């Protein structure tokens, strides 16, 4: 006697993009194999993976770069199908990721000696590709807000680029003015934004970075990796709306000519999000859809601020519940606030 | 249990092979980043180049 | 290094059905993130755009022109083509070929097309 | 359907001075711009892909600005290699249209 065959989830419909607006179960699972294309700023005569060569000499007083020579981060989008019918008061019936899994796309490009390198000594080969790395990714349901970082305020980038307002010296530190979205591939310098760490509850980013002058790049390719993204309460990147945004930038080392200008090089990344489906609270009911019905139509109001630096509204009092009546009217919270403590 | 179902990737795809070498055909700007038009089939020995 | 030509007729009578050949050498007809598009700029107008062709069966046409075409590909001598029906008198104009490209410039821009070629119909 | 309207029509300028062009959509599209340089009786060329990339032939005189709907060709001195005809293209990506625009022909006095 053998053994009867063991279960697995029995494999539905397959097929290219427009397979997603088919409507499945209320237990559907879905598996999304996908890639990206790095912007590594793509020269001229057809190199298209490369950057131009870096500048050497600018001082501090005045930078002037181009648009080619800056690397950007990569993103996209994809279309999500919507899940609920009729109305259903109470509960909505959203999409989630779970599982990511990476891979780098044409790792052994860098073994090619006979390329226009340098000659690294006399009658060897050519040099390789070396020096700093920067590998980076994000899954989540939501443009990923990031945090303006740079160094030296007096560059003046060009006009393609979607860069930081009013340098200072306060940019070159944890500033908090420096807040924006990232909603374009190819416009965003990865030398002047860091993902903020602060803002992100729908947003997961994994970043290994090493500089150095001439480090070896070390590289993985593997099938059986697996990344839960599921937090400690038990929940992904929710798709809020309907979409789900992947956003990467993959950065490989510098590359020498055969003369000695430096030129950057990238490569491509995969991505293979699991989704399923979950059931939430409603964040959209006839209330919300009754206020955005009349702030549509009622007249602007443009008078003196009651919101921010400069506001106007002082003291807010805001009290329900009744209590034994207190032996003073303004009881005190903080102990010391300022401080008049020893030495 | 299948042979080993690989990708086309390279760069300075005006580089010309000689004959014993299973090449990506038509070499195109997108085959330096990801190109979709480089499927294949491991079958030979000593005839894919690993770069 | 890519160059390009156009080839066809010179002459085409009222109601009758146009033939163009945008001449490609030096590179693949079959080329990965490349289309093959249509320019006409008729005399006393701007340009006009008509259609573009993807290998592995892209297409898309200028609505206007009401979907009166076909656009085929043969690979043995590096060309594509295309085909008009039912040509009238306001079809007099100097016709271009371009490509676009997808990952880099995005456009009819690379200094990349054929040189021209000039179309006459009339009684 | 998309239209890019041009204006102005016909710009009467000397040479030397500042151009600008302006290739106003009817709806946003904010990145897929061209400007396509054809003289009369020669073969279109590229000014600027991407709305400000400038191209590798084109000494940067020329450049791109502007991103949403209100479009900007900046010129700072013309050529008299210049006073030819000037177009403007929109790009797709859901839908296939990237149609073109109307044209403005730089008058020489």
């Known amino acids: 006697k053998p053994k009867e065959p063991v279960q697995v989830p029995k494999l539905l419909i397959k097929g290219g993009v427009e397979v997603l607006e088919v409507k499945t179960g209320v237990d559907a699972i879905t598996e999304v194999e996908c890639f990206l294309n790095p912007e590594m700023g793509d020269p001229d005569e057809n190199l298209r993976g490369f950057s131009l060569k870096l500048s050497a000499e600018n001082d501090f007083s005045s930078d002037s770069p181009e648009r080619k020579m800056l690397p950007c981060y990569s993103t996209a989008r994809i279309p999500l199908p919507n899940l609920n019918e009729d109305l259903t008061c109470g509960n909505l019936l959203m999409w989630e990721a779970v599982t990511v899994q990476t891979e780098v796309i044409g790792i052994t490009s860098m073994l090619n000696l006979h390329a226009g390198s340098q000659k690294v000594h006399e009658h060897g080969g050519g040099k390789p590709i070396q020096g700093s790395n920067f590998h980076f990714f994000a899954v989540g349901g939501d443009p990923l807000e990031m945090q303006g970082v740079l160094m030296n305020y007096r560059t003046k980038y060009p006009d393609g680029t979607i860069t930081p307002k009013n340098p200072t010296a306060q940019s070159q530190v944890m500033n908090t003015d420096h807040k924006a979205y990232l909603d374009k591939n190819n416009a965003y310098p990865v030398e002047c934004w860091v993902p903020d760490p602060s803002r992100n509850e729908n947003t997961r980013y994994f970043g290994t970075f090493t500089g150095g002058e001439n480090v070896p790049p070390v590289l993985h390719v593997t099938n059986t990796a697996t990344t839960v993204l599921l937090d400690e309460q038990g929940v992904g990147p929710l798709c809020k709306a309907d979409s789900l945004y992947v956003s990467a930038a993959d950065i490989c080392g510098l590359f020498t000519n055969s003369s000695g200008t430096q030129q950057w090089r990238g490569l491509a990344r995969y991505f293979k999000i699991r989704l399923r489906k979950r059931s939430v609270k409603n964040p959209y009911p006839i209330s919300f859809l009754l206020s955005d019905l009349i702030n549509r139509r009622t007249q602007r109001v443009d008078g003196q601020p009651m919101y921010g630096m400069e506001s106007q509204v002082e003291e807010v009092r805001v009290f329900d519940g009744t209590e034994r009546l207190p032996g003073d009217p303004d009881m005190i919270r903080y102990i010391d606030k300022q401080g008049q403590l020893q030495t | 249990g299948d042979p080993l179902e690989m990708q086309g990737v390279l760069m300075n795809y005006r580089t010309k092979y000689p004959d014993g070498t299973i090449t990506p055909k038509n070499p195109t700007a997108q085959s330096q980043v990801m190109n979709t038009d480089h499927k294949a089939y491991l079958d030979k020995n000593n005839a894919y180049p690993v770069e | 290094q890519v160059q390009l030509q156009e080839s066809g007729p010179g002459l085409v009578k009222p109601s009758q059905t146009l033939s163009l050949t945008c001449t490609v050498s030096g590179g693949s007809i079959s080329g990965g993130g490349y289309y093959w598009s249509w320019i006409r700029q008729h005399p006393g107008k701007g340009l006009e755009f008509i259609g573009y062709?993807?290998?592995?069966?892209?297409?898309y046409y200028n609505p206007a022109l009401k979907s009166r075409l076909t656009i085929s590909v043969d690979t043995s001598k590096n060309d594509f083509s295309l085909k008009l029906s039912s040509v009238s008198a306001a079809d007099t104009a100097v016709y271009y070929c371009?490509?676009?490209?997808?990952?880099?410039?995005?456009?009819?821009?690379?200094?990349?097309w054929g040189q021209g070629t000039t179309v006459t119909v009339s009684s | 359907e998309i239209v890019l309207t041009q204006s102005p029509v016909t710009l009467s300028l000397s040479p030397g001075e500042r151009a600008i062009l302006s290739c106003r959509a009817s709806?946003?599209?904010?990145?897929?711009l061209a400007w396509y340089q054809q003289k009369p009786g020669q073969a279109p060329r590229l000014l600027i892909y991407?709305?400000?990339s400038r191209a590798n032939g084109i000494p940067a005189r020329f450049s791109g600005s502007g991103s949403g709907t209100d479009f900007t060709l900046t010129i700072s001195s013309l050529a008299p290699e210049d006073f030819a005809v000037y177009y403007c293209?929109?790009?797709?990506?859901?839908?296939?249209?990237?149609?073109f625009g109307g044209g403005t022909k730089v008058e020489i006095r």
């Open positions: 062709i993807y290998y592995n069966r892209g297409t």
């Open positions: 709806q946003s599209v904010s990145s897929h």
């Open positions: 293209q929109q790009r797709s990506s859901w839908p296939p249209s990237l149609t």
């Open positions: 371009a490509r676009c490209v997808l990952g880099g410039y995005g456009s009819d821009a690379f200094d990349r």
């Open positions: 991407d709305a400000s």
